[PDB]
Design a protein around this ligand. Sequence first.
Ligand SMILES: Nc1ncnc2c1ncn2[C@@H]1O[C@H](COP(=O)(O)OP(=O)(O)O)[C@@H](O)[C@H]1O
Ligand SMILES: Nc1ncnc2c1ncn2[C@@H]1O[C@H](COP(=O)(O)OP(=O)(O)O)[C@@H](O)[C@H]1O
Ligand SMILES: [Mg+2]
Ligand SMILES: [Mg+2]
Ligand SMILES: [Mg+2]
Lengths: 49, 256, 259, 415
Amino acid sequence: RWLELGLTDEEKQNQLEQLAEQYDELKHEFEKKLEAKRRKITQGDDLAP
Amino acid sequence: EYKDNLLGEANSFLEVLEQVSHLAPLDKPVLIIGERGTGKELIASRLHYLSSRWQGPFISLNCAALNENLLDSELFGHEAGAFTGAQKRHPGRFERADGGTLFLDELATAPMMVQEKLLRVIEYGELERVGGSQPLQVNVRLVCATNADLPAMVNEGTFRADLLDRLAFDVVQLPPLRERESDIMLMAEYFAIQMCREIKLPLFPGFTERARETLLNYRWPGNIRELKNVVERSVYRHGTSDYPLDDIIIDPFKRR
Amino acid sequence: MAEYKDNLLGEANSFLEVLEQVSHLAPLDKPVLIIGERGTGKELIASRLHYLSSRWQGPFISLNCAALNENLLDSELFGHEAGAFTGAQKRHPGRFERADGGTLFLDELATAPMMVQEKLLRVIEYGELERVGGSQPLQVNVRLVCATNADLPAMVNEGTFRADLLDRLAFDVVQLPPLRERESDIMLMAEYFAIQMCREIKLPLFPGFTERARETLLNYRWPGNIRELKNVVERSVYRHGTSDYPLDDIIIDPFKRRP
Amino acid sequence: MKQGLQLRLQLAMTPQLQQAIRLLQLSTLELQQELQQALESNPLLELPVYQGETTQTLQDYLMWQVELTPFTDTDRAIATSIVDAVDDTGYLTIQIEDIVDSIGDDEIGLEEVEAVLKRIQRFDPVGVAAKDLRDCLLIQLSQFAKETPWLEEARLIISDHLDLLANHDFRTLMRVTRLKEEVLKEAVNLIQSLDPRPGQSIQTSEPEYVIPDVLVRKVSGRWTVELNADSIPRLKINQQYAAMGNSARNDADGQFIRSNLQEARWLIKSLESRNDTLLRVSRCIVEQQQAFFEQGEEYMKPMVLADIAQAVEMHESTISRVTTQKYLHSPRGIFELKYFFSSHVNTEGGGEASSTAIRALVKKLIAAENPAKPLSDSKLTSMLSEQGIMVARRTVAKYRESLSIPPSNQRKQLV
Ligand SMILES: Nc1ncnc2c1ncn2[C@@H]1O[C@H](COP(=O)(O)OP(=O)(O)O)[C@@H](O)[C@H]1O
Ligand SMILES: Nc1ncnc2c1ncn2[C@@H]1O[C@H](COP(=O)(O)OP(=O)(O)O)[C@@H](O)[C@H]1O
Ligand SMILES: [Mg+2]
Ligand SMILES: [Mg+2]
Ligand SMILES: [Mg+2]
């Protein structure tokens, strides 16, 4: 968003920082669930000896 | 790189260093006419990190403290179970030599026999003290260093002609302690900073120019870390480098 | 029976004739004792004889006397077959025993054990040797090889060598043309060493040297006969380190204070 | 000072623990065999049919056809004798001459034997009783119609040109057989699908045979290794005889029974301690396996008897006897203890260790080189240079023979 162009630059700056934060937060959380699932994909089964 | 540490602003320190650099690819003996508490070891390092085989072994074993006549025979080798009470030669020095050079400190005391045994090494270098084992050579170079007076040894005959000669291929006079005076101010501050940092002393006291003058007055022939030693003394004299530096300690024997 | 001349260089003095007499000796296997400057033609002479030793002659058993510590120098001397001397195990055969037929590469080290001296006297006794606990004598064989660097007759008058040290020693003597004496292949072996030196330096071209250097070379004593000069030569090579760049001086006495 | 050896620092040995180590180095199958043959005298040392279905086994399947085939008594005897010495692959074990000798009839001749074999040569399947298989593939192709192309080229090659294909010498094969370029390979391929060891085809079924002795299940990293409980031997002290000894009027005889029982108790406890020492050693080995087996044999450090015995107080002979003929089933599966150790090397991986599955997968990649030809030892050396670990062509030939790979100029094949 123009990297907080400064429309209010005060809470809009603050809100924008918070929002980008949450955005990356979601990106990471999504990738994390993705990685756990993908691990489960090739997680592998226990056959008899 | 020896951290480039021990800076000698005496451009002769540099000149020595340049000789060293020329010597660096070079693989032949060298004497370093060192000084009492000077630090030929550190410079020999600075060389070794730059050695033509800088990747090569770099061991520091001097026979100055050769309290055992047999510590020698060891250093020359041992048969596996030679004499007995033992398994094999503890050959570490002989190890460093192959794929390495030779470095020693204060070669004065050597049993003359020990010395010329070293002679039978340098020209050819058999597997030695090996209790009859067949010979073997260590791809060994060399470097020499001392504060002794070589003419004094020559009068003493301390180095044999074969010895003094084939032993020696270069001569590295450490500048006298006071020789490298601008270097003294240099590496002096070098230590000053190094200390103020590593001590984590919250502030650096700096230096009193009067203390600097008094320090320069120290002939301080010993300065190897004897510089650093008197430095630690002075640091304690300050005790804490928070205040600006004036408390300089040289002679610590003094009570009160 | 081959050349193996190796870096036997600079014999333009009668050291050539010295070599000739050496050759005259070379067939005979009897005791060898020589004389001359340490680190200077000397052990090169040793190589010379080692060539004089038939290639098929055997192990050039090198004898370096400045070693041997004190005692079980005795072990490898007489031998050590028993227990409690050399890790026991097999009869440890001494370097003396190591040579069977080999070179008695006796080095004139002037160490204290005339004790040793008498031992070697028995080493040179009847062609025989007997170990530590060495339950039997064993009639041994080896080529015999000594040399010198100092006044053996004086030390005899000085009593310093066992009289028999020399008495058994030296079927004849073999000295060296001193650096103050030999003085002939000066430029010659000078250039030979220089060639080797530049080649190792991989110096692009032979610097050349001014005649002032050779004038000094005549002027120089060269107390160490062969190497001290040779070291000097390589030292000139280094202190210059330039290709085709004609020399005008040499490096020998770094003890000379710098200017 | 004056060094050497000097006096300082006996009794009677017995083979007790020595026989015990003889047992341990011996495999637990026969080790339990002795354990039974031991505990027998030590008195204090402790439907019928189901499915019941028969099968053919091929040779009797051949006999089934022979029964329906018209045959005489001598013909039946020769055919049955031919059937008797028959291999799994379906090739004839004995030559025609050995069969003639076995018939033991002067009327029986090599020609009659050959006629009987040929009438039975291709009944079921084609290429039965191959008799130094070569004409067997010939009869198999003859069974195929001539309408298949390149049958002539394949036939001429199989006639007397087996050697040219033996070395994969395609150039010499073309120079000899005058076989067509890029077309003789077609005859070669038609020959390649010729049901070799066709009798081996019938044989397909087996049961399971590997004994899990220890079990490491990779329990939450650093596997929880555990031995097999039932496989671990154990005796029961004769508590009846323990109570049948003291009260024995011969309190001497009964108390001596008690003493022998106590000694055997010592023996059994020592065996259990041997098991437990092997077990703690297995704990160290499993600590190793949590990386090695988990990284597989490719990333496995070569270990030595010295190395392991150092981690324990067990003697090097103690361990060296302890693991001999030992195998454990792991997450990977049943793996032999003798397999655990490996020789180290001068590779520039910064260290010394063993090739193993690295050598195996190296053979894999050398094969994975263009199927035109096998990769030479220089290919292995370059592969190791890529691996950054030093390997040599003599070393490469060594590791390849360890992986038992085909030779560089022997495995070249038409792509
Ligand atoms: N250039 C230098 N840089 C750092 N330390 C030095 C230097 N020269 C000497 N020293 C110090 O002197 C102490 C002893 O040094 P030195 O006298 O060189 O060893 P030696 O006693 O073998 O000559 C060493 O621990 C080293 O820290
Ligand atoms: N032709 C030569 N040119 C240059 N140097 C030589 C020559 N011959 C011998 N030297 C040098 O003389 C040194 C001592 O040799 P030598 O006197 O044989 O030793 P030793 O004391 O064992 O007899 C050697 O290190 C060698 O470098
Ligand atoms: Mg020192
Ligand atoms: Mg010598
Ligand atoms: Mg006598």
